[PDB]
Amino acid sequence: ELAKMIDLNFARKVVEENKRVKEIVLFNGLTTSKLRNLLELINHVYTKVYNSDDTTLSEDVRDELEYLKVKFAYESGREPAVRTFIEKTYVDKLVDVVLKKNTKKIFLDYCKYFEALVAYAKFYR
Amino acid sequence: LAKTKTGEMIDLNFARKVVEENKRVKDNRGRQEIVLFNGLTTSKLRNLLELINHVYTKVYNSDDTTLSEDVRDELEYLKVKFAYESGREPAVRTFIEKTYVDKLVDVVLKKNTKKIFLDYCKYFEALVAYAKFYR
Amino acid sequence: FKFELSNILKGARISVIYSGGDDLFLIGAWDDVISKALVLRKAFTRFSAGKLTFSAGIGMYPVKYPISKMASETGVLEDLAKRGEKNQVALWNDSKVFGWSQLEEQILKEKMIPLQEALTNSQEHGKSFLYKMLELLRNEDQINIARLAYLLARSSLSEELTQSIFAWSQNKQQKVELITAIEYLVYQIRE
Amino acid sequence: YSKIRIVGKIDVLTGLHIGGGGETSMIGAIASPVVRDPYSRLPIIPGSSIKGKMRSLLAKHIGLIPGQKMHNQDAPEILRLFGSSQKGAIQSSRLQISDAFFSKASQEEFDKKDLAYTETKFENTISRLTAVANPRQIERVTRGASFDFHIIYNVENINEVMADFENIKTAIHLLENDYLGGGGTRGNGRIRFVIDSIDTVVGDFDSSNL
Amino acid sequence: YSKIRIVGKIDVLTGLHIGGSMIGAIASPVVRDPYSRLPIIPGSSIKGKMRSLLAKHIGDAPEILRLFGSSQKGAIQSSRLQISDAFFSKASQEEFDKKDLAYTETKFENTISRLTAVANPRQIERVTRGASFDFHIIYNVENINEVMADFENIKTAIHLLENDYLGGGGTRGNGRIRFVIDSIDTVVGDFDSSNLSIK
Amino acid sequence: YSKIRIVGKIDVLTGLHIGGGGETSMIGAIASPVVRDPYSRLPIIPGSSIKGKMRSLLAKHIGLIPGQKMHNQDAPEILRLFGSSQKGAIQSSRLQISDAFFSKASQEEFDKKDLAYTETKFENTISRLTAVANPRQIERVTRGASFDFHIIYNVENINEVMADFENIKTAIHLLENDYLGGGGTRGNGRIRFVIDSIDTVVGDFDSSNL
Amino acid sequence: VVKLVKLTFKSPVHFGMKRLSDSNHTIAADTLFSALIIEALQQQLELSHLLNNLVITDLFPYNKTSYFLPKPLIRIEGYKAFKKLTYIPVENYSEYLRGEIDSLEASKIAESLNLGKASLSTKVSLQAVDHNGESEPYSVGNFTFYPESGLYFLAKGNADTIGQLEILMHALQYSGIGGKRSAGYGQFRCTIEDSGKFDSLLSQTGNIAILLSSAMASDEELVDCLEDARYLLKKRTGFVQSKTYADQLVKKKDFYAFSAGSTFYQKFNGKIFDVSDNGRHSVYRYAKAFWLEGKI
Ligand SMILES: [Mg+2]
């Protein structure tokens, strides 16, 4: 329940629409490696978030999430396919609302949404 | 990290705003090519980023929470190199003066903390990545 | 109830504790008990022109388990099954109150048999894959469904079976049906 | 009848992977998480792992009866110390080895240096046929971890106390050589029982010379 | 006649599997309150462990029989220790509801056989460390002359229990507990129990 | 039941890269860093890496059965030395190779020489259809550093201990001829072994011959 | 003066009826009276008031909403729903007596009882492993009442008897009730208060009388009270619980008493039956009658 709706069903349906078959090509040609690198960054922040027990995001994880947004923008600039994927799934906007909420729960559902995106992207291939 | 004039803070979203402000479409011969910081390309940006990269690696390997004297002299040489490069090319001069990086290195020298230097490195990352993104 | 029931259970490891009056208390191997309960339901529908219905409860207990506890717990199962509307079969845990058609076809026919044939035909996957699917399905969190998809992506299973498993996991009733089919197959494939 | 505590510490010399379960793996996260006590969310060494490793090593040193199918067929010293469950002839265990928790000292030295308690070691599996890797993440425990191992010894036969403690010494020496937890064959598990403090908690037994 | 109430908490030092289904599930679930589903400590487990420890320290003994009841021929004695079930405390309920912590945990264990070196998985449910149970004990003062002695015995038992385990695989590091005797208040009779302490 | 402990030196002949993920990398910095002991923050040769490399080299040396889809099915000497997992035929692992940590001798040598134990190597992929290069930064371990590797061998079959230690020596030689860690086909991972001492820590076996 | 005593149970109760593996959710008046006698002996009080003048009912369920009563055994003008029905709330009692409760309402009433949940806890005995042999596992059936529920009863007697009952119930709170009261079961807290709805209900004259306690009359009363009456003879038995009765535990003489809810057209005052046999003290069994009159 992040924003507008944005849920795991949104992830499955958006991967379905952006899927096109010629071979299977998703999000105008996004390889699984770029998505895996993005998920690796997600894992790097998520491990630190999970290890801490307090329900409020610390300053360190907030700075790491701003870094994650910057990395998202860099990846979009590097490859058009990653840019189209980021725009169609609005991941950076979810990062922004996670920053706005300052709650561990919102980050956790954001990570769940990202993992659902990865899972459905692999499944439809 | 630090503070600029008019009360504006130094952050990664500030780097986004700075790169956006210095973006002009500047169509030529019917072709839409994006120019940043009044003629600045990405080769100069990568050179400056590598200059930051060397000191970042040196500070990242060390476990000390206080900036070593060797890294302090690294940063002084960084200031000298930044001044030289800005003097060389007007576009790099506008880039340096608009992003306030030359003041930021002074702030990180005064703070004398590894964390502050890492934050400044992240800010320079935001600058270069966001310049790549808007292009 | 008395003469024909002996013919009904012929060939199965069943010891009829008592046909009594209308109620039937029967003890045997779990596989044979369930199969013969289904056959009994079908024969009971054939008899009396299908205007009579009967509710049954089936329970799983270890061999060393006391008989009194077996009787009491299967009785509570049948009480829960008859608590619903007309015929029900309260197989195993109270959360598995099924119907006769549902148990015979929707659980042991459309789901169990494809899983079995995939297991025996495949040379690379075994019981651990089924246990991973079961762990995914038992979890109530929605994200697990997506995880299931990922597993089914690298499962090397047939595409038709993959899509059917995904569809079953999406729906609630079909999810519990697939859970029951997986548990039954694991029980049948143990040791 | 006396109760003697052997509270001390365990110095991990390499990573320590005592796996667990009950948690589904988030995509790209740790495939095999280390066991953690849920309240503190810290890696622990369950007393079951310690007792099993000590018993297995001591049984190997003393000798296993050929064709030993059950743990209750070990040598009578092992059954006397670690416990046995035969039919009618049941021997109570004089050793009670508790879960070893993450030490507060190690917690402080890991909060300093900004170091995570566990280390997500990144591994692969090169197949013999196609020579293709297979990534794996194992949540080992870092080298600086110290665990507060807590053992209770119950003195039942006063005459065998000395021999039992010699057995314990041999087993802990064997454990100083052998690993604790899984993956020990591939670098994990090395430990050293450096820190000890033995005293009689309950009774009148002499614990100075133990 | 007098009855002395001993209330307190049973702090869990290692996951307590007091013992008491589907494939790939908890093979040995702990006992739960039938409605609340909260894990509890059966008072029979406490009474049995304390009786065993007191008997081992003492050594059928008259003290054990007079404290924990005897049905033997001739010597019929009413048990003086009525140890009620220890229920999950509200404070631990709140502390576990925060940080979204499950009341129990599922320890995965195995057993390497001495013959084939094969392992056998085992999902033991244990009440998670840091869980507090509101234990409750009643002492029946049948005779005023042997109160103190019995209390001494009780103390011994409790002391032993704090170095031993409660129900479960305690020798493998389960169920270590600590009694926090919140009070010892007389509820029936005029007997004064201020000077008696369990610990 | 005696444990024979091997302790020796692994001196890096060339740069050593053993990758590990989960580390945030700055733009233009090391893209693929080496594994680090989180405590010492120093390069480390994991015991898993050494054991896997040695087993792979030995199994290639003696031979691989065709269609070998699993590691359990292999030459039985490797099963005895390093372990097995086959259903109904589990063989205990007689070799427990542990992590190789950065020695104080080489660390102090580098400290006196004013050298960092790691190095950043610049490389690039030149696509040849367009002659377009894509650069990368790999971390390596500075040549001249030394690690202390510590193996423990359990003597279960006394008759074949000589053959088993001969196999260990042969595997060590195979690790000499080859690399360890990341892409050594391009020049990384060269190492050197210096066997410091072989002894019998626990038990009554004779270690003079070995 | 009739006092409503409500017991809220802190721990699950055994309340066996014929064995240990079962768990009834209530107890008869004889069980409660024997508990009161044991308490009055322990507290060194005088048993004259409990015996000569005290009339108590069974333990009946009560929820957060309604106080339940036994279903009277009266003729019905479907049938299985009424047979399964056991308890009727006080509000729906006079309606049931007049027959206005149909099968659906009876089934809804039966489902409306939220007294609690009955479970079976399996226990072990390790008194043989220490010497030689194996552990002996047994099972105890317990019944955990829902948080707002409880078991109530009514007591009738003199003011002195009411005070003595209050003292005995205060001691019983910690003594425990039901079986296995020394192994963790049966602990409860009791509240004694004047009853308003029950006082109005019992001060009602009807054509029939309903037993509220397990009772039985002597020879003279039984020759007149058996006229076209519907009842249920329940077998009250058990071993003797005392220290000064015999060297080994000795069973009582078998007793049979009318169950609660039985309907009789003639009201009989019961007597306390001595079910002792070769013992040092008479083992009393409560069989006095608590009558509630109704119209059908
Ligand atoms: Mg019937």
Curated annotation (Swiss-Prot), chain A:
The keyword Kinase does not apply. Signal peptide: none annotated. GO terms for biological process: defense response to virus. Pfam families: Csm2_III-A (PF03750). InterPro entries: CRISPR-assoc_prot_Csm2_III-A. Belongs to the CRISPR-associated Csm2 family. CRISPR (clustered regularly interspaced short palindromic repeat) is an adaptive immune system that provides protection against mobile genetic elements (viruses, transposable elements and conjugative plasmids). CRISPR clusters contain spacers, sequences complementary to antecedent mobile elements, and target invading nucleic acids. CRISPR clusters are transcribed and processed into CRISPR RNA (crRNA). This is CRISPR system Cms protein Csm2. It comes from Enterococcus italicus (strain DSM 15952 / CCUG 50447 / LMG 22039 / TP 1.5). The gene is csm2.
Curated annotation (Swiss-Prot), chain C:
One of its GO terms (molecular function) is exonuclease activity. GO terms for biological process: defense response to virus. Residues 1-94 form the GGDEF domain. The keyword Ion transport does not apply. Belongs to the CRISPR-associated Cas10/Csm1 family. The N-terminal HD domain has ssDNase activity. The C-terminal GGDEF domain has the cOA synthesis activity. This is CRISPR system single-strand-specific deoxyribonuclease Cas10/Csm1 (subtype III-A). The lineage of its organism: Bacteria, Bacillati, Bacillota, Bacilli, Lactobacillales. The gene is cas10.
From Swiss-Prot, chains D, F:
The lineage of its organism: Bacteria, Bacillati, Bacillota, Bacilli, Lactobacillales. Encoded in a type III-A CRISPR locus. It holds the Pfam family RAMPs. It comes from the Bacteria. This is CRISPR system Cms endoribonuclease Csm3. CRISPR (clustered regularly interspaced short palindromic repeat) is an adaptive immune system that provides protection against mobile genetic elements (viruses, transposable elements and conjugative plasmids). CRISPR clusters contain spacers, sequences complementary to antecedent mobile elements, and target invading nucleic acids. CRISPR clusters are transcribed and processed into CRISPR RNA (crRNA). This subunit has the target ssRNA endonuclease activity; it cleaves multiple sites in the target RNA at 6 nucleotide intervals. InterPro entries: CRISPR-assoc_RAMP_Csm3, CRISPR_Csm3_endoribonuclease, RAMP_III_fam. Keywords: Antiviral defense, Endonuclease, Hydrolase, Nuclease, RNA-binding. Part of the Csm effector complex that includes Cas10, Csm2, Csm3, Csm4 and Csm5. The keyword Hydrolase applies. GO terms for biological process: defense response to virus. Belongs to the CRISPR-associated Csm3 family. PANTHER family: CRISPR SYSTEM CMS ENDORIBONUCLEASE CSM3 (PTHR35579:SF3). It comes from Enterococcus italicus (strain DSM 15952 / CCUG 50447 / LMG 22039 / TP 1.5). GO terms for molecular function: endonuclease activity; RNA binding. The keyword DNA-binding does not apply. It is an enzyme of class 3 (hydrolase). NCBIfam families: cas7_TM1809 (TIGR02582).
From Swiss-Prot, chain G:
CRISPR (clustered regularly interspaced short palindromic repeat) is an adaptive immune system that provides protection against mobile genetic elements (viruses, transposable elements and conjugative plasmids). CRISPR clusters contain spacers, sequences complementary to antecedent mobile elements, and target invading nucleic acids. CRISPR clusters are transcribed and processed into CRISPR RNA (crRNA). The subunit probably binds to the 5' handle of the crRNA, helping in discrimination between self- and non-self. Part of the Csm effector complex that includes Cas10, Csm2, Csm3, Csm4 and Csm5. The keyword RNA-binding applies. Belongs to the CRISPR-associated Csm4 family. GO terms for molecular function: RNA binding. The gene is csm4. It comes from Enterococcus italicus (strain DSM 15952 / CCUG 50447 / LMG 22039 / TP 1.5). Coiled coil: none annotated. Keywords: Antiviral defense, RNA-binding. NCBIfam families: cas5_csm4 (TIGR01903). This is CRISPR system Cms protein Csm4. One of its GO terms (biological process) is defense response to virus. Encoded in a type III-A CRISPR locus. InterPro entries: Csm4, Csm4_C, RAMP_III_fam. Signal peptide: none annotated.
